[PDB]
């Protein structure tokens, strides 16, 4: 099973959203981290089970999240476009090294002991040190990476403390939940319930009779 | 303090979104409950504290959630536009009878004992019985109004079980949260923290130095 | 398996307790909702599993709770007997439409999506509108219906706020818990433990050696 | 403030309930613990705050719970009347040594460090050793004393595992709740709410307009 | 499977630590309860599953905790050595009557209904009465045994309030956890994970490649 | 207020424990990070409130935990001494950049937004890259730094999975708790209680009458 949109269009639209950025530090760091991690970002999945488990699923996750972030930021002008876009591209980038590969997905030792938050934080700091960038945008992106899961029980070391962090958390939940929730409702006749999914707090969903 | 958009434009946009509806039963029921509760919907606030405590705040809340629902539904074609729009309009309608008025906001006996969910379930069923509609559309709207707070600890009798119910939950969270978060960060200089807000799990927020 | 007391004696005792009522509005509304839902109240069970799963179990549940409520109201004169009796009779009425029937018990779409609480709030309000009764006893009975489970995690939208609501809670839990504990303790030799039942917080019970 | 019933009638009715017991070991042990702790049982309060804080309030607690246990035992014949009565009498006996006295009630070192449960388990075993009684009745009474608070978070070392233990817990909760709940409702006009009480999970209670 | 150290050397070391004590009351009580419960102390295990499930395992638990308590007492002079040693010896003594025996370990009715805390507190107070000791030493040891599990959810009636109670809690955690967690990593090759053990909050452990 | 031990003896004993290490990679990385952060490690405190809030408190915390880790490593030979010592030295090193200084302690933007865990993981990765060390001991130390608070609710991104991680967690608990719990008991007459300390789950502590 592959993504519905082919991979090089996803790469082109992500590069276009890089080109749309205005803050030079943000675009430089994000373009570097996408460019050096290009193949694994374009191939690897975004989890092991229950969401985005297909090949090039990370890329589809990223593109859908940027589209919905563009919608939210167009409706609410108070947000920063560039910081949000960099945070939404870079937040699940660390799973290029947490997971083993597109074939026979498995947690490696580094991702199982560390996690995709802390490995991406240190990768971001290393990129900032290499590109001779020592401004506050690095630390704010590092926070966006740090707290995109929202709460301590789900893996965040710290609660979100910036507007863009809460935006990132809500878009992540909505996108992942909608993808698994559309996958759950596919093989169900209208008027029938769905299978008991696990990552949706152990719930069963109803397809109404009027959805054709 | 009033809403930034004057009130009759909000009413015009809500009636426009009524006219955009395709399902006859949904459109008829939603138009009835909008028309009969018109003045209190256009005047009353949408809470007592920490969000939408100003006059005609319910109308701004509803219009903002319709706009963001339009964005999400345009990006995800799987959702039903009509059911989502009706669930957005009717979910905080009950606070026209839970709250006392735009002046000296206070919980009445009916709102404090019952709540804004169980009062609109009853109101929706009365509207369905009066307009001679006995379709599953009514029951799915009862679910949308029933579980829009998302979890039992926040006031939901049941967990959400339909797609538009979870979208209702997330849109309500995001709109209320970003309104209270923008109200918190208005009077804060860049590089300074904000006041410790209560509705956001007792947290503080940092305004970055590059936000002008 | 049937109830130990035959059904028309249960109906006669419930009608006698209706006749013992002194408040005209309470008596009229309660008699209407008993008379209109008579056959399903007299046939349907009171749950699906772990308690009152036999035919005419709802009637035995109601009669046993009325006996307990008569005892508690006799010892404590501060309670209102009329409101308590009505809240006892009406609180599990909703499972005439939540459940499918005495044979092959299953949750219907209305009961699974809404629940037995929110359907009886609506039914009670509709009965009040039909009998031209618009007094506060309807609202207090709606609270009794609303919060008879007591806590949010068990399905109550609001915590109890009136005395008879907490009495409804404690009589409900005591009656259901005693019946499931008696059913677990039937087939156990003294000096032996019971099966690990699920509805009692996953516990086991010891039958003492001197219980014959 | 004294109990509504004078003290010597209360001692007489407790001795009458001793006489009504049929099991010789239960009757002997319970009479021993009532006799040797007589004055402090008849004088001391049953808490420091929020319930039974008046002089001779422990006796009122015991008498009211005997009456409620008699009602529940008359309605449900499966329970053992004697062991339930002994558990009702002996469960809050330990506060004769947890509390300092009727005047200036305060926790002593033994009650604060150990608790009223573990001190009555010890007292019960010492009385059993002194009266040359080595039957399972003693151990079941020790379990009644051990788990009368129901859950670990409220002070019970173990969950209840006997029918009379759960009936002990529910009678204790209902009587303490009723006394604090009637004391909250004394000074409140009809149609007015009550003061925010602490031990009722931080709730406010409503007096309906028809209670005179 | 037996303990690595033979039993009579272990009894000799416990007797040596008894002789090391300076407080006469503590030393007398602790020697009395070691002497009278000697054979079952030297034979019985210290749990049913997941830790110290082998014969003479309770003795190994006690001896290792005395050694580690000696370490903590040597580094931290503010602790009382005698009180700590007595609390370490006597906190799992009660499982000589909770468990059935070294062969076919099973919970008896006394241990399952009551627990090893409440039976051991009673044993301590009975020995205090018999040895004609009425000092605060008995009450502080009663608290040490009462709250050695640390929290209410794990079985403690009261939270620890004395220094040696927290010390006993932490040494008990560290010793039991280290024995179960050394037993988990015995059969695991370097670079491989361990079996998902239940007593360690359902976690898995990694053996590093450089551990030979 | 200063630490009881003057500072250069603490530096000498930490350097001695560095010299006692046998693993070359561990020893090199740990000496590099101690030497580079030397002055702030020797001056800064280890928290803001409730523990180690005095000047040079980090050094005293580190020295006491090394002594206790030496005790545990001597008693339990299965542990790795070098990895444990490095994890004990480096776990609160990040507070040289989280905190402002020994005078007027306050959280900086980096420490408050990120935390001392994720800063120190990044510093470990940078030190490994600079010293040209790319072996798994870096990753195991990174996990030691990551999970030394033990649970998600206290700030750990991941649960501990290596033996030295659980040992580091327990020694951190014991040392911090003991210093705050000795500080609470200094000004209390024997036979009197202590003030309710916040960091110990709001408990009150008793000083026994026989402690002189
Ligand atoms: Mg993530
Ligand atoms: Mg994502
Ligand atoms: Mg709402
Ligand atoms: Mg809303
Ligand atoms: Mg119910
Ligand atoms: Mg019921
Ligand atoms: Mg009690
Ligand atoms: Mg009581
Ligand atoms: Mg234990
Ligand atoms: Mg132990
Ligand atoms: Mg730390
Ligand atoms: Mg530390």
XYZ file of N, CA, C and O in Angstrom, chain D residues 21-160:
560
model
N -28.755 -10.328 69.497
C -27.837 -11.184 68.758
C -27.999 -12.639 69.177
O -28.340 -12.940 70.324
N -27.753 -13.546 68.234
C -27.913 -14.976 68.464
C -26.594 -15.730 68.541
O -26.526 -16.760 69.220
N -25.557 -15.253 67.867
C -24.273 -15.946 67.859
C -23.552 -15.662 69.171
O -23.333 -14.492 69.501
N -23.191 -16.688 69.951
C -22.595 -16.428 71.276
C -21.241 -15.735 71.233
O -20.976 -14.868 72.076
N -20.377 -16.086 70.276
C -19.046 -15.486 70.220
C -19.121 -14.009 69.849
O -18.469 -13.164 70.483
N -19.916 -13.689 68.825
C -20.121 -12.304 68.407
C -20.693 -11.481 69.551
O -20.213 -10.379 69.851
N -21.724 -12.013 70.209
C -22.381 -11.301 71.298
C -21.427 -11.061 72.459
O -21.369 -9.950 73.000
N -20.637 -12.076 72.821
C -19.707 -11.941 73.938
C -18.625 -10.907 73.643
O -18.351 -10.031 74.472
N -18.018 -10.980 72.453
C -16.940 -10.053 72.114
C -17.463 -8.624 72.003
O -16.841 -7.677 72.505
N -18.615 -8.445 71.353
C -19.160 -7.104 71.183
C -19.583 -6.505 72.520
O -19.338 -5.319 72.773
N -20.180 -7.313 73.406
C -20.513 -6.812 74.736
C -19.259 -6.449 75.520
O -19.250 -5.445 76.242
N -18.180 -7.224 75.364
C -16.941 -6.892 76.059
C -16.381 -5.549 75.601
O -16.032 -4.700 76.432
N -16.303 -5.333 74.284
C -15.750 -4.069 73.797
C -16.663 -2.883 74.086
O -16.168 -1.764 74.267
N -17.981 -3.083 74.121
C -18.860 -1.984 74.513
C -18.704 -1.679 75.998
O -18.680 -0.511 76.404
N -18.571 -2.713 76.831
C -18.529 -2.498 78.274
C -17.226 -1.843 78.708
O -17.239 -0.912 79.522
N -16.088 -2.305 78.184
C -14.820 -1.774 78.676
C -14.511 -0.392 78.105
O -13.741 0.362 78.710
N -15.092 -0.035 76.960
C -14.929 1.292 76.376
C -16.175 2.158 76.531
O -16.420 3.027 75.697
N -16.950 1.958 77.601
C -18.313 2.487 77.658
C -18.345 4.013 77.708
O -19.068 4.651 76.930
N -17.572 4.615 78.617
C -17.667 6.055 78.839
C -17.189 6.846 77.627
O -17.842 7.813 77.208
N -16.064 6.444 77.043
C -15.549 7.151 75.880
C -16.406 6.899 74.644
O -16.498 7.766 73.770
N -17.030 5.724 74.549
C -17.983 5.469 73.472
C -19.204 6.368 73.603
O -19.756 6.835 72.600
N -19.639 6.618 74.834
C -20.821 7.420 75.102
C -20.540 8.922 75.081
O -21.482 9.713 74.962
N -19.275 9.338 75.136
C -18.934 10.759 75.186
C -18.267 11.304 73.929
O -18.614 12.401 73.489
N -17.316 10.580 73.342
C -16.415 11.130 72.336
C -17.124 11.384 71.008
O -18.110 10.722 70.680
N -16.640 12.347 70.224
C -17.173 12.547 68.874
C -16.620 11.514 67.902
O -15.698 10.756 68.207
N -17.209 11.495 66.707
C -16.876 10.506 65.689
C -16.020 11.068 64.562
O -15.791 10.368 63.572
N -15.560 12.312 64.682
C -14.597 12.924 63.767
C -14.125 14.225 64.399
O -14.489 14.558 65.531
N -13.303 14.960 63.654
C -12.941 16.313 64.052
C -13.699 17.364 63.250
O -14.087 18.398 63.805
N -13.914 17.129 61.957
C -14.580 18.099 61.102
C -15.555 17.404 60.160
O -15.442 16.210 59.872
N -16.543 18.191 59.721
C -17.460 17.947 58.607
C -18.529 16.886 58.855
O -19.483 16.810 58.077
N -18.430 16.111 59.939
C -19.484 15.163 60.299
C -19.311 14.648 61.721
O -18.198 14.296 62.125
N -20.413 14.620 62.479
C -20.472 14.032 63.822
C -19.453 14.665 64.770
O -18.846 13.986 65.601
N -19.265 15.976 64.649
C -18.253 16.684 65.420
C -18.761 17.150 66.777
O -18.011 17.794 67.518
N -20.005 16.842 67.119
C -20.598 17.239 68.386
C -20.373 16.158 69.438
O -19.958 15.036 69.138
N -20.638 16.522 70.695
C -20.471 15.584 71.798
C -21.523 14.483 71.692
O -22.653 14.712 71.239
N -21.114 13.259 72.045
C -21.927 12.039 71.937
C -22.402 11.795 70.505
O -23.434 11.161 70.274
N -21.634 12.282 69.527
C -21.986 12.059 68.136
C -21.652 10.668 67.648
O -22.273 10.178 66.697
N -20.673 10.018 68.281
C -20.370 8.630 67.956
C -21.542 7.721 68.288
O -21.861 6.802 67.522
N -22.205 7.974 69.418
C -23.374 7.190 69.788
C -24.507 7.387 68.788
O -25.216 6.433 68.454
N -24.699 8.620 68.306
C -25.751 8.871 67.321
C -25.438 8.181 66.001
O -26.332 7.611 65.359
N -24.165 8.217 65.593
C -23.704 7.477 64.424
C -24.035 5.997 64.551
O -24.640 5.400 63.650
N -23.688 5.405 65.696
C -23.893 3.974 65.911
C -25.379 3.625 65.922
O -25.800 2.658 65.286
N -26.201 4.417 66.619
C -27.630 4.105 66.717
C -28.323 4.246 65.364
O -29.123 3.382 64.966
N -28.020 5.321 64.625
C -28.627 5.502 63.310
C -28.213 4.393 62.353
O -29.039 3.891 61.575
N -26.944 3.977 62.409
C -26.511 2.893 61.541
C -27.084 1.541 61.963
O -27.332 0.699 61.097
N -27.306 1.306 63.265
C -28.046 0.110 63.677
C -29.450 0.095 63.101
O -29.922 -0.950 62.638
N -30.145 1.233 63.140
C -31.506 1.267 62.612
C -31.523 1.025 61.103
O -32.353 0.254 60.592
N -30.593 1.653 60.376
C -30.506 1.432 58.933
C -30.117 -0.005 58.601
O -30.647 -0.585 57.643
N -29.204 -0.594 59.378
C -28.815 -1.980 59.158
C -29.965 -2.926 59.456
O -30.116 -3.950 58.784
N -30.791 -2.596 60.452
C -31.983 -3.390 60.721
C -32.950 -3.342 59.548
O -33.508 -4.374 59.156
N -33.148 -2.156 58.964
C -34.036 -2.043 57.806
C -33.511 -2.846 56.616
O -34.263 -3.595 55.971
N -32.212 -2.721 56.327
C -31.628 -3.424 55.185
C -31.627 -4.934 55.417
O -31.866 -5.716 54.489
N -31.389 -5.369 56.656
C -31.430 -6.795 56.959
C -32.846 -7.350 56.896
O -33.034 -8.511 56.516
N -33.849 -6.554 57.274
C -35.231 -7.006 57.151
C -35.645 -7.133 55.692
O -36.388 -8.053 55.333
N -35.186 -6.218 54.835
C -35.539 -6.328 53.423
C -34.763 -7.415 52.690
O -35.319 -8.047 51.786
N -33.503 -7.648 53.049
C -32.646 -8.627 52.375
C -32.290 -9.724 53.367
O -31.381 -9.539 54.199
N -32.967 -10.874 53.330
C -32.742 -11.899 54.364
C -31.408 -12.621 54.255
O -31.043 -13.333 55.199
N -30.677 -12.474 53.149
C -29.437 -13.223 52.969
C -28.320 -12.745 53.886
O -27.383 -13.506 54.148
N -28.394 -11.512 54.375
C -27.353 -10.977 55.239
C -27.423 -11.604 56.624
O -28.475 -12.069 57.071
N -26.283 -11.616 57.307
C -26.215 -12.073 58.688
C -26.416 -10.869 59.597
O -25.635 -9.912 59.553
N -27.465 -10.920 60.415
C -27.848 -9.765 61.217
C -26.854 -9.506 62.343
O -26.498 -8.350 62.612
N -26.386 -10.570 63.000
C -25.544 -10.425 64.185
C -24.187 -9.829 63.831
O -23.711 -8.890 64.485
N -23.550 -10.374 62.797
C -22.227 -9.914 62.401
C -22.278 -8.510 61.816
O -21.366 -7.703 62.040
N -23.353 -8.188 61.092
C -23.551 -6.821 60.618
C -23.699 -5.850 61.781
O -23.110 -4.765 61.769
N -24.480 -6.228 62.798
C -24.659 -5.358 63.958
C -23.343 -5.136 64.693
O -23.037 -4.012 65.115
N -22.551 -6.199 64.854
C -21.262 -6.066 65.525
C -20.309 -5.184 64.731
O -19.581 -4.364 65.309
N -20.294 -5.340 63.405
C -19.485 -4.467 62.575
C -19.923 -3.018 62.632
O -19.091 -2.113 62.548
N -21.230 -2.777 62.757
C -21.720 -1.411 62.912
C -21.261 -0.821 64.240
O -20.838 0.339 64.308
N -21.327 -1.607 65.314
C -20.961 -1.080 66.626
C -19.459 -0.814 66.714
O -19.031 0.223 67.235
N -18.635 -1.717 66.185
C -17.202 -1.694 66.461
C -16.357 -0.925 65.449
O -15.145 -0.811 65.656
N -16.935 -0.400 64.365
C -16.078 0.101 63.291
C -15.463 1.459 63.622
O -14.288 1.694 63.315
N -16.218 2.362 64.251
C -15.683 3.642 64.702
C -15.451 3.667 66.204
O -15.488 4.737 66.821
N -15.222 2.501 66.807
C -14.903 2.470 68.228
C -13.524 3.058 68.488
O -13.320 3.743 69.496
N -12.588 2.859 67.556
C -11.201 3.266 67.734
C -10.990 4.743 67.952
O -9.957 5.137 68.508
N -11.953 5.569 67.554
C -11.862 6.997 67.808
C -12.049 7.356 69.277
O -12.017 8.548 69.604
N -12.247 6.380 70.169
C -12.128 6.673 71.589
C -10.668 6.875 71.962
O -10.372 7.511 72.981
N -9.742 6.342 71.159
C -8.320 6.533 71.389
C -7.624 7.316 70.290
O -6.494 7.760 70.502
N -8.252 7.481 69.123
C -7.719 8.396 68.120
C -7.908 9.848 68.541
O -6.993 10.668 68.401
N -9.084 10.182 69.057
C -9.416 11.549 69.421
C -9.068 11.813 70.883
O -9.008 10.901 71.710
N -8.831 13.088 71.191
C -8.401 13.456 72.536
C -9.559 13.452 73.525
O -9.388 13.044 74.679
N -10.738 13.897 73.100
C -11.887 13.944 73.972
C -13.023 14.764 73.396
O -12.920 15.322 72.301
N -14.144 14.830 74.120
C -15.263 15.673 73.665
C -14.926 17.151 73.603
O -15.497 17.875 72.778
N -14.013 17.622 74.449
C -13.614 19.023 74.497
C -12.245 19.143 73.847
O -11.342 18.353 74.147
N -12.106 20.121 72.947
C -10.893 20.397 72.168
C -10.398 19.136 71.452
O -9.322 18.601 71.717
N -11.243 18.680 70.527
C -10.985 17.451 69.788
C -9.750 17.599 68.906
O -9.643 18.543 68.118
N -8.816 16.660 69.042
C -7.591 16.680 68.259
C -7.057 15.262 68.141
O -7.327 14.410 68.990
N -6.297 15.021 67.077
C -5.654 13.731 66.877
C -4.512 13.554 67.869
O -3.673 14.445 68.027
N -4.482 12.405 68.533
C -3.347 12.051 69.366
C -2.268 11.424 68.483
O -2.450 11.251 67.276
N -1.124 11.086 69.080
C -0.033 10.505 68.306
C -0.397 9.111 67.801
O -0.081 8.751 66.660
N -1.104 8.323 68.615
C -1.443 6.961 68.220
C -2.457 6.956 67.085
O -2.303 6.217 66.107
N -3.493 7.786 67.194
C -4.501 7.834 66.150
C -3.983 8.424 64.852
O -4.343 7.965 63.765
N -3.145 9.458 64.946
C -2.615 10.087 63.743
C -1.616 9.166 63.057
O -1.622 9.037 61.828
N -0.771 8.489 63.836
C 0.269 7.674 63.228
C -0.294 6.352 62.716
O 0.023 5.932 61.598
N -1.156 5.696 63.498
C -1.684 4.385 63.130
C -3.038 4.473 62.429
O -3.180 4.040 61.281
N -4.036 5.028 63.100
C -5.380 5.087 62.568
C -6.355 4.259 63.394
O -5.976 3.368 64.158
N -7.643 4.568 63.225
C -8.680 3.904 64.007
C -8.987 2.495 63.523
O -9.676 1.754 64.232
N -8.501 2.110 62.346
C -8.737 0.762 61.839
C -7.764 -0.227 62.472
O -8.164 -1.241 63.064
N -6.466 0.069 62.364
C -5.435 -0.841 62.839
C -5.404 -0.942 64.356
O -4.864 -1.918 64.888
N -5.972 0.032 65.067
C -5.987 -0.053 66.522
C -7.153 -0.921 66.995
O -7.025 -1.674 67.969
N -8.286 -0.891 66.283
C -9.378 -1.798 66.623
C -9.155 -3.223 66.159
O -9.688 -4.135 66.793
N -8.393 -3.447 65.086
C -8.007 -4.819 64.766
C -7.202 -5.417 65.917
O -7.464 -6.544 66.371
N -6.248 -4.645 66.442
C -5.448 -5.081 67.581
C -6.303 -5.289 68.826
O -6.143 -6.292 69.535
N -7.218 -4.355 69.103
C -8.074 -4.476 70.279
C -8.983 -5.694 70.178
O -9.209 -6.398 71.170
N -9.504 -5.960 68.978
C -10.361 -7.115 68.758
C -9.597 -8.413 68.971
O -10.107 -9.346 69.605
N -8.362 -8.486 68.465
C -7.563 -9.692 68.664
C -7.191 -9.883 70.130
O -7.184 -11.015 70.629
N -6.879 -8.791 70.834
C -6.563 -8.887 72.257
C -7.765 -9.362 73.062
O -7.626 -10.197 73.964
N -8.956 -8.851 72.740
C -10.163 -9.299 73.426
C -10.470 -10.759 73.114
O -10.940 -11.500 73.986
N -10.221 -11.184 71.873
C -10.417 -12.584 71.514
C -9.464 -13.493 72.279
O -9.851 -14.584 72.714
N -8.209 -13.068 72.438
C -7.256 -13.856 73.212
C -7.636 -13.893 74.687
O -7.440 -14.913 75.358
N -8.174 -12.790 75.211
C -8.534 -12.743 76.625
C -9.776 -13.579 76.924
O -9.838 -14.250 77.961
N -10.761 -13.570 76.031
C -12.006 -14.302 76.244
C -11.936 -15.756 75.794
O -12.976 -16.427 75.806
N -10.752 -16.236 75.401
C -10.525 -17.628 74.996
C -11.420 -18.025 73.821
O -11.993 -19.115 73.783
N -11.534 -17.122 72.851
C -12.322 -17.342 71.644
C -11.365 -17.343 70.461
O -10.645 -16.362 70.237
N -11.359 -18.439 69.708
C -10.422 -18.624 68.603
C -11.166 -19.137 67.373
O -10.757 -20.097 66.720
N -12.282 -18.493 67.047
C -13.140 -18.905 65.948
C -12.985 -17.930 64.785
O -12.390 -16.858 64.919
N -13.530 -18.317 63.629
C -13.457 -17.488 62.430
C -14.305 -16.227 62.551
O -14.128 -15.290 61.755
N -15.209 -16.186 63.536
C -16.004 -14.992 63.801
C -15.116 -13.787 64.074
O -15.394 -12.682 63.586
N -14.038 -13.994 64.835
C -13.102 -12.921 65.158
C -12.453 -12.381 63.893
O -12.330 -11.165 63.708
N -12.034 -13.279 63.002
C -11.344 -12.858 61.788
C -12.285 -12.117 60.843
O -11.885 -11.133 60.205
N -13.542 -12.556 60.753
C -14.487 -11.844 59.899
C -14.814 -10.470 60.486
O -14.968 -9.487 59.747
N -14.900 -10.366 61.819
C -15.066 -9.047 62.431
C -13.857 -8.154 62.177
O -14.007 -6.943 61.971
N -12.651 -8.728 62.207
C -11.459 -7.941 61.910
C -11.468 -7.458 60.469
O -10.977 -6.363 60.172
N -12.020 -8.257 59.558
C -12.172 -7.776 58.188
C -13.219 -6.674 58.084
O -13.067 -5.750 57.275
N -14.302 -6.771 58.860
C -15.296 -5.697 58.873
C -14.681 -4.392 59.357
O -14.935 -3.322 58.792
N -13.874 -4.467 60.417
C -13.174 -3.291 60.917
C -12.159 -2.792 59.898
O -11.980 -1.578 59.740
N -11.515 -3.711 59.175
C -10.405 -3.349 58.302
C -10.870 -2.543 57.098
O -10.242 -1.542 56.734
N -11.966 -2.960 56.466
C -12.362 -2.438 55.167
C -13.696 -1.703 55.198
O -14.461 -1.782 54.233
N -13.999 -0.987 56.280
C -15.251 -0.244 56.312
C -15.192 1.051 55.516
O -16.245 1.637 55.242
N -13.998 1.514 55.141
C -13.897 2.719 54.327
C -13.892 2.414 52.836
O -13.934 3.347 52.028
N -13.847 1.141 52.454
C -14.159 0.739 51.096
C -13.019 0.713 50.101
O -12.894 -0.240 49.327
N -12.187 1.748 50.090
C -11.160 1.870 49.070
C -9.847 2.284 49.715
O -9.813 2.789 50.840
N -8.760 2.049 48.979
C -7.427 2.333 49.497
C -7.208 3.827 49.695
O -6.561 4.240 50.663
N -7.747 4.651 48.792
C -7.524 6.089 48.856
C -8.188 6.739 50.065
O -7.780 7.834 50.462
N -9.195 6.097 50.657
C -9.863 6.636 51.832
C -9.361 6.042 53.141
O -9.791 6.492 54.208
N -8.469 5.055 53.094
C -7.878 4.535 54.312
C -8.028 3.044 54.541
O -7.535 2.521 55.545
N -8.700 2.345 53.633
C -8.846 0.903 53.812
C -7.604 0.178 53.315
O -7.191 0.388 52.169
N -6.974 -0.649 54.152
C -5.835 -1.450 53.673
C -6.201 -2.421 52.566
O -5.403 -2.645 51.648
N -7.394 -3.001 52.629
C -7.852 -4.003 51.684
C -9.259 -3.667 51.220
O -10.035 -3.066 51.969
N -9.607 -4.019 49.987
C -10.995 -3.898 49.546
C -11.881 -4.871 50.300
O -11.409 -5.928 50.747
N -13.158 -4.539 50.489
C -14.076 -5.476 51.148
C -14.251 -6.753 50.340
O -14.285 -6.732 49.108
